[PDB]
Each structure stands twice: as structure tokens, then as C-alpha cells.
Amino acid sequence: MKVFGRCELAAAMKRHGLDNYRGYSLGNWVCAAKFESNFNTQATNRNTDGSTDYGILQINSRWWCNDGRTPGSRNLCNIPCSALLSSDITASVNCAKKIVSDGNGMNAWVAWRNRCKGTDVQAWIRGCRLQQHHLGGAKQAGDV
Fold first, then answer.
1. Which of 29, 53, 71, 92 suits 39 as a labelling partner, its CA being 20 to 30 A distant?
2. Cα 77 to Cα 87: distance, rounded to the nearest angstrom
3. Ramachandran assignment for 39, one of left (phi > 0), alpha (psi -120 to 50 degrees), beta (any other)
4. Where is the C-type lysozyme domain positioned along the sequence?
């Protein structure tokens, strides 16, 4: 039930405000969600903590949402966790733009600082507006 294809996602996240949210331009969010889930809106990871990592952007149940399973859940987003395991990424967005306003940005996503950070992440939104197929692709902020 909805594993995305790269520009479909990329553009959806353009449609919802991540394109340059607190410093991070689009290509950084297409690349964390790839290395976090492979654009699969239904992943679920348990950990030695007692939490699970849900949704597309792998948001954890210790801090963020609430499954009614993690002990000491803090549910900062005040969103049930399973509002995250669904096909429309409005919740997953509305929580991720809250993670990067509780620290120095995208270092909560362990996949992003490892496999995406220090790459030319712009290449993840190349070929794109939703795969257009003329050499590479689009434009969305900082024209110069």
C-alpha cells in the first residue's frame, strides 16, 4: 500500500513544505526517507528501547507519536503512531517538521547523517517533477 517511486515522493514533499524547511532543501528529505524505508509508507522497526520506528520517515514511539506500547512515551507530536503508517504523508510531514525544531535539524534520522549527509543530495530530485523525461529535471528555490 504505497511504496513510492522517487519523484512521486519528492514532489509530494514539495506539495507539503519540506522544500527548505529549516535549512534542508528537498533532496535531503527524499534521501533520508529512502535510507529510512525505501519510500515504504508501512515500515515498522522494533528496538531494545521498547519503542518502534513507524511510517515513511521512521518516526520513533519513545518521543514522537504514541502506539500505546512504549514505556515513557512522550508523544511530542500528539499523534497516535498509526496515524503515521498510512498512504497520505500529511502526519509524517507534520511530525518530521517538529523533529527538526527540537535539535540541530536532521541528525535524528540516523540514515540521513550516514548515507545521505555529505553527498550531493540534490541528485535525488534530478529527472524530476514526477519523472519528466527530458535530461535530468527541476528547479525549486535558489535560482542563480
1. 71
2. 18
3. left
4. 2-130
